[PDB]
Amino acid sequence: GMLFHQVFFWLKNPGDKADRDKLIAGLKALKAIDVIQQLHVGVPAATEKRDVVDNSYDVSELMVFKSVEDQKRYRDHPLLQKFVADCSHLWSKVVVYDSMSV
């Protein structure tokens, strides 16, 4: 199975388009890291707001890795550290779900 690295970000300034765009752009530029197999960035969809749906985050990220070792290499990659240095002031809260496919 593959590894699905899912992150949801809540901005310090929710609804601030400039900060949101900066965060999105910063995430997308991580495509420079060759261990990332897929890189998707998103925002809440206009789906029916059901009780079980959390639409309160501002930006979502989905990366796919071949393995836990490749994800580890991403984690330790200088370009990811630069992104956190550049962009972590933008967010107040993050939730990460790392899943291995079955």
Added chain:
Amino acid sequence: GMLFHQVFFWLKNPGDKADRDKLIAGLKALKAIDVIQQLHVGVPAATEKRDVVDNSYDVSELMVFKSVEDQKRYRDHPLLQKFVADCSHLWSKVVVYDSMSV
């Protein structure tokens, strides 16, 4: 952009392999619904357990749709209703994140 439908399930009986497998199998069989573009089912990865990583769910699901209207068609599909009827007794809690890619 595409629609990423992400669901995390916590089992009533966490760690019960039989229930987990039943849930996984039930999710995978939703491939019968033609509006689903991709269907991935997983469990927590053995990634480094960081404070921001929630590894407490038992089963994860990722579906991709072309549009909010296609997701709506999935939502209303009899085969999804059958899955909920068949399998909802297995889980105690669900969290859903519906993201549109940007």
